[PDB]
Each structure stands twice: as structure tokens, then as C-alpha cells.
Amino acid sequence: MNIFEMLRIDEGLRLKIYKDTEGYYTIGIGHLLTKSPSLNAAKSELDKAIGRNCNGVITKDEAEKLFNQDVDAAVRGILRNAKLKPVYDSLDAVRRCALINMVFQMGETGVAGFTNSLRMLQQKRWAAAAAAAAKSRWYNQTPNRAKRVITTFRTGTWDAYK
Ligand SMILES: [Cl-]
Ligand SMILES: [Cl-]
Ligand SMILES: [Cl-]
Structure with missing residues (x-):
């Protein structure tokens, strides 16, 4: 077992923006996007982080890069x-x-x-x-x-x- 395998089990891997337990917009493997209530801001945050227009959805490869x-x-x-x-x-x-x-x-x-x-x-x-x-x-x-x-x-x- 390693830190990566450990975290993947604890965070799960999700490819579309979601609210965390606390209602925060998150994506990939536990990647916090914003505490802001606005899904609009979450989508912005997202394209800026990936460097592309994602429309709130990303690839596994992009999720792994954020994880790394x-x-x-x-x-x-x-x-x-x-x-x-x-x-x-x-x-x-x-x-x-x-x-x-x-x-x-x-x-x-x-x-x-x-x-x-x-x-x-x-x-x-x-x-x-x-x-x-x-x-x-x-x-x-x-x-x-x-x-x-x-x-x-x-x-x-x-x-x-x-
Ligand atoms: Cl839990
Ligand atoms: Cl304590
Ligand atoms: Cl307590």
C-alpha cells in the first residue's frame, strides 16, 4: 500500500463536479475547487486548473494529474x-x-x-x-x-x- 492507493480509497475518483460532505465543490480525487456556493465559480475554477474548458467534467488522466x-x-x-x-x-x-x-x-x-x-x-x-x-x-x-x-x-x- 502507498500514499496514493491510500488516498484513492479514501477519496474515490469522480469525473464530474460534486459537493463534498461539507457542500464544497470538488472533483477528481478529493480536489477542492471552491468553498463558494456558486456552481458557476466552481466551473471557472475547474477550467483554470485544467487549462481547458471542461464544462465541469474531466478525464481520468486529468484527475490523476491534479492528484499528483x-x-x-x-x-x-x-x-x-x-x-x-x-x-x-x-x-x-x-x-x-x-x-x-x-x-x-x-x-x-x-x-x-x-x-x-x-x-x-x-x-x-x-x-x-x-x-x-x-x-x-x-x-x-x-x-x-x-x-x-x-x-x-x-x-x-x-x-x-x-
Ligand atoms: Cl466516511
Ligand atoms: Cl487535538
Ligand atoms: Cl467533539
């Missing part, structure tokens, strides 16, 4: 982030995938807000980190996904995805 970019951005954002970096550095590999997963979904700012879980991850108190992360809006909004990512962090293994 979003994942790369998650990774560099962690590595440049004063708060996220020391955490990432301190972890083993599978747990590192968990943190990237979280940053891809909520952004570097969202994740930096999980102050208490970040601190226990650093301190290697797995159970405490899981319990803290579980008390979050994230958790209550997309529970199956959150449980999988949490379990990943908790255990250091890929069991939840297997």
Missing part, C-alpha cells in the same frame, strides 16, 4: 511547516502516510490546529493521540475515513486499509 499535484503540495507543506515538520520527522513510515492523508483533506492549517494530538504523536503516546483526534468535527463529519486514518496513526500499520 495535490499530494506533492501536502508533502511540501508539511516539510515547510514549523509545527508539522518535527512531528513528521519523528515518525515511522506508515504513520507518516497518515499525517499526509490528513493534510491532503484538511489543509496544513486545519492539521496544525490539532495541537494536542500532534503533541502526543511526537511523544509517542498513540492511544492518547487517537482519542484526541476523535474529538473533532473531522471525525464527526467523515467517520469511516477518520477511523481508518486514526487507526493508522495509532498502530503504525496498514490494517485498516486491508
Whole structure:
């Protein structure tokens, strides 16, 4: 299993604009287009991102290109982030995938807000980190996904995805 396979299972692959759980316009593999309520703006956003007139629909190949970019951005954002970096550095590999997963979904700012879980991850108190992360809006909004990512962090293994 790798970060890509991990995220594809968690986001699914959709070729036409859709609303996320939060009502936000998204496309491809969890690619946020806009928080704006307007589908018009979502379609604009979309043609600008692809560099073509899509009329709200894209190809698998275009979805993958956006994915390659979003994942790369998650990774560099962690590595440049004063708060996220020391955490990432301190972890083993599978747990590192968990943190990237979280940053891809909520952004570097969202994740930096999980102050208490970040601190226990650093301190290697797995159970405490899981319990803290579980008390979050994230958790209550997309529970199956959150449980999988949490379990990943908790255990250091890929069991939840297997
Ligand atoms: Cl927290
Ligand atoms: Cl809560
Ligand atoms: Cl879910």
C-alpha cells in the first residue's frame, strides 16, 4: 500500500463536479475547487486548473494529474511547516502516510490546529493521540475515513486499509 492507493480509497475518483460532505465543490480525487456556493465559480475554477474548458467534467488522466499535484503540495507543506515538520520527522513510515492523508483533506492549517494530538504523536503516546483526534468535527463529519486514518496513526500499520 502507498500514499496514493491510500488516498484513492479514501477519496474515490469522480469525473464530474460534486459537493463534498461539507457542500464544497470538488472533483477528481478529493480536489477542492471552491468553498463558494456558486456552481458557476466552481466551473471557472475547474477550467483554470485544467487549462481547458471542461464544462465541469474531466478525464481520468486529468484527475490523476491534479492528484499528483495535490499530494506533492501536502508533502511540501508539511516539510515547510514549523509545527508539522518535527512531528513528521519523528515518525515511522506508515504513520507518516497518515499525517499526509490528513493534510491532503484538511489543509496544513486545519492539521496544525490539532495541537494536542500532534503533541502526543511526537511523544509517542498513540492511544492518547487517537482519542484526541476523535474529538473533532473531522471525525464527526467523515467517520469511516477518520477511523481508518486514526487507526493508522495509532498502530503504525496498514490494517485498516486491508
Ligand atoms: Cl487535538
Ligand atoms: Cl467533539
Ligand atoms: Cl466516511
